[PDB]
Amino acid sequence: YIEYPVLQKILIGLILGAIVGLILGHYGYAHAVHTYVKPFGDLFVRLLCMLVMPIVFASLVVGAASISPARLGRVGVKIVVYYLLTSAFAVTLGIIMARLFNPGAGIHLAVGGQQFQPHQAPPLVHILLDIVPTNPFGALANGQVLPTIFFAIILGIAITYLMNSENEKVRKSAETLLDAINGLAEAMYKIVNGVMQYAPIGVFALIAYVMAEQGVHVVGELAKVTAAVYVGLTLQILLVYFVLLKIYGIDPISFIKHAKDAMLTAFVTRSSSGTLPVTMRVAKEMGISEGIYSFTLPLGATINMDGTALYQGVATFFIANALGSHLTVGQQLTIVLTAVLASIGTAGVPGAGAIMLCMVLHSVGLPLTDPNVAAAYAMILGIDAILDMGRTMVNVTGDLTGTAIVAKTEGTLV
Amino acid sequence: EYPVLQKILIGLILGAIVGLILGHYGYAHAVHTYVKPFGDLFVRLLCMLVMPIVFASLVVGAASISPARLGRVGVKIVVYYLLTSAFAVTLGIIMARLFNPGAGIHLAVGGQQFQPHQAPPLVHILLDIVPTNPFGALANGQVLPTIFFAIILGIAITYLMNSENEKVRKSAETLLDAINGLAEAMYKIVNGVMQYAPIGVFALIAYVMAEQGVHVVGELAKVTAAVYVGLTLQILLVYFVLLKIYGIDPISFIKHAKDAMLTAFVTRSSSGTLPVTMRVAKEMGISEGIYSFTLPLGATINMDGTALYQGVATFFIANALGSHLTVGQQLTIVLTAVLASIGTAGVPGAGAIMLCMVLHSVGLPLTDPNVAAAYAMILGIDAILDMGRTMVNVTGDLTGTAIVAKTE
Amino acid sequence: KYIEYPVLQKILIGLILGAIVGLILGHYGYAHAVHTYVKPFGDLFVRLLCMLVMPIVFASLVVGAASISPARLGRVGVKIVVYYLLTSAFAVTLGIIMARLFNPGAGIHLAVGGQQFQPHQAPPLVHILLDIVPTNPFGALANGQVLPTIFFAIILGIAITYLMNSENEKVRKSAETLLDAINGLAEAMYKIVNGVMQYAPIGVFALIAYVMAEQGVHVVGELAKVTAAVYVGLTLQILLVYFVLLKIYGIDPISFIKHAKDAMLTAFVTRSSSGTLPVTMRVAKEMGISEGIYSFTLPLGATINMDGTALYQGVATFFIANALGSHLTVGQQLTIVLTAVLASIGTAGVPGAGAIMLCMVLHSVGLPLTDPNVAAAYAMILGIDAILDMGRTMVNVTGDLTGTAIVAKTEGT
Ligand SMILES: [Hg+2]
Ligand SMILES: [Hg+2]
Ligand SMILES: [Hg+2]
């Protein structure tokens, strides 16, 4: 059948696809690929941008409700502060690395015969006022990004306040609504898994055309991306986690020795949740309180922002850079912080890195319909699989780093 | 608030007489200005629920039929309906080509004939089944994407009900429970709208008769006929053969269903009839533990009745527009319609509701005067057709529960 | 850094303080600078409100419809509903009456862009009646078609009640779940308003600051003229209907008020049918209303009481239309006003329902809230809504008791 290690399939689809593309590039048929292979790629891209709205919205409602004070616990408030200070660093490293290696420059895409031309921007007044949806159903209906973010947050928070009410009529109503929204977000995730079953074919078709038509330069450019990620990735573990543990009297060396297979599971399954049974067992091996890890671990699975913050730092810069538009530090963080803010509750979430990207593009007015934007996004989407293994692996490590720092601040260790 | 079907038939029979005399020496135009708006109110009220029912109905439907959520006695009854609908489709088209309903009524209302557009590149029509934004598809009536999303969602929910996580599992249970109920309410609303249907159906044919001459009655009777003969040809040609193939006697089988069919034929309700259906299944000696499960499904998932309705209706509608339609597209459009109606067996006037959904999905704006005036015709006789629809649905539900019961 | 100080106080402070600032900056000041710098805060406030107008009206009506819906409706229910229908009827007539009595809007002929607003007119009745029916309800709901939304929200709520009358427990829990989540969306939308009223002091400051600075000093008289027309019709309701209705039911009106005294005073000051509900029930027991009666009728008047809104709209509608330059007749008025009221059912409060309905009414008529004039006209009412909304609630609560007592003594079982 096709149930064989889904990730194996996708990496086979990428490696094999680039070879097919690239040799049909050299003496081949850039155009034939474009007429015949590519539409299979397009289907894949559509199946992704599809759920981009339901997941962002329904995910944020649930996510907001999670962190919403003071439905949030006191042991919880400390773990929230944790992810906030780490996301802060994860963002800096993101940008830093994306500037350090310069992914995108060197590939000047001008696909229809013309380069893409960002039309910016309205007056700040006009753009701040417009985050407030004129009509919340409509925002959601026709893909209005920022408004949906803002309404989804303000609603998730509202729900929690309703679950602090004496009126039981009221309390269950909220509990019902949130539960229903939850199941939606939940179903959306299961749908993604199904799409990832098609991903090996679709991703084959995507890079096949990119390779066939962009030339061979691309492979260097993509390795440039992945590199900037995995080096910021490990730079995170070493520079922040290890420091934060050191600074909490915890031993970083022996810490790793327990996390070892929990990171390796995460690296391999791409799944904060798939990995969560392993994570929890390791948390116990380190001797974290039962009452603690059984609460804080199922959070970092969803609200851990550090992984995605790194992805976007590099994805953002590549995507904008390949388009040809030179992007500054101020725009960078502006963009990235906003993606991260809105990512909360989508930690995994199969391929959230790429999903946030769409939602961020849609937000900066770069129509996915444009051929350049399209062929640009298609590149990152290709290697997303690779990137998403590091993304999860850092997520999990940081979840343990945090749940162990917070564990010790409760006096429940060994 | 007196027997509802009586009223719709009273209104139709009565309405054509009124329209037809007022047509002849009368004032086709007057009717058009004063009588007709009541008719248009009716068509709107229907096209209204076309979206919610299709979406909500399919989410629920797909979650029924979904693997691994489906049961063993269930898998067989589904396999039953799949292979009966197969044949029901064939008869539909076949009868629709046999009698030629529509041609000979050449409607060109505005002083101009309707002119269907075809067709974007296969590539572009296939990529487009995938909604770019699901809320959007839903919001501004995109048919194929809504089907595609509603199926892919229903299946997803079932996987969530096979989860270790009780939080996850309850949430799915809830979402589904609320979509169901939306579905459910949608139907309740139809029952009420059918309360206006006698006035509405009066107004509709009144105009059609007053304006399209007397040729119409022949053309409509042509439809009715093509359904009722496909209808009984289904009972005899498939059910009887399936009963015989499973040692059940066709003749004495009917002797038991006799009132259950008569009830179905007169209530238009697979569900309204359900108590009578189950009573007969007991009289025939089916296991309690089998008919109490399989009969409530046939009432929702039985595609055979609709499959004949769409076959014929589709061919009439298109044919009357002027557009001659081939066997290939006939089937393609039909499979699509039936394969989206799952979980709406009855569901009062489902037959017509689907038609609207298939029309909106295949070019053909319901706002267009030709398209409108043609759909107004079938909408008129829907009541007649919808009685045979249900009656055959119910017969095939017993045939299925009996065949499956025997294998147990 | 914490302004969790009495929320109403803040809005009143913001109004009085805002008008002075604007008015002095108006005279020799910088109408323009206010427009460029203070106003954007006033606009952000109008956006947060106009935001919820769709979800509150829809999800609110669904629940509302369900609550009045037969035959889920009790016999103790049927009477209280009939009560409210006959009181809203009069509540409307007084609204229009007072709106015509004082003439708010005239004398302020607003032509803001350098051009006066022009209401379009009306398609044939056929076309407007057919169009109350949503061709696609998700679409109605998604892009703000008001009339089709109303009609779908009612026809939905009612259907949901019938599903609760089914022997199929599948069917029955399904309906119960759906309603449970629609309510609760409703409920959350209300919580989101409470947060918006938190910024309302700042926003209401900015709003009148500009209208004062730019519209002159004639505005303050015109607004006092509104509030007057409401508060007098408001007490004309108590004296002219409730008191005549209590008397006509052998009940003593003066000694009735002696119990309601604080129950009305709470409502006047909290702006909250729900916040006041504890105080209200305590008073219905003091008046010696049955426990199994007020435990049902008081939580209804809290949501379905239409009389308070009926007055507000009578005046708001006339002022808004009058200021724009369109003179509006008594037919037009009720047609506009019945409609709003009839669709307000289940939104009694709901922090600021009065203004909320008005948008929804403005959108429905054909006055695009983006229009410079319409905006500057709505902005004025939005400003004093807070004042009007205290009276609104207070009248509502008096009439909930007047009702629960009239129905109560017709019982004694
Ligand atoms: Hg996308
Ligand atoms: Hg329709
Ligand atoms: Hg508004």
Swiss-Prot record, chain B:
The keyword Protease does not apply. GO terms for molecular function: amino acid:sodium symporter activity; chloride transmembrane transporter activity; identical protein binding; L-aspartate transmembrane transporter activity; metal ion binding. Residues 23-33, 96-113, 211-222, 313-329, 365-383 are extracellular. It is found in: Cell membrane. Residues 253-281, 330-364 dip into the membrane without crossing it. Na(+) 1 binds at residues 298, 302, 393, 397. The chain crosses the membrane at residues 4-22, 34-54, 73-95, 114-152, 189-210, 223-243, 290-312, 384-404. Changing residue 387 to R: Increased rate of aspartate transport. One of its GO terms (biological process) is L-aspartate import across plasma membrane. Sodium-dependent, high-affinity amino acid transporter that mediates aspartate uptake. Has only very low glutamate transport activity. Functions as a symporter that transports one amino acid molecule together with two or three Na(+) ions, resulting in electrogenic transport. Na(+) binding enhances the affinity for aspartate. Mediates Cl(-) flux that is not coupled to amino acid transport; this avoids the accumulation of negative charges due to aspartate and Na(+) symport. In contrast to mammalian homologs, transport does not depend on pH or K(+) ions. Belongs to the dicarboxylate/amino acid:cation symporter (DAACS) (TC 2.A.23) family. This is Glutamate transporter homolog. It comes from Pyrococcus horikoshii (strain ATCC 700860 / DSM 12428 / JCM 9974 / NBRC 100139 / OT-3).
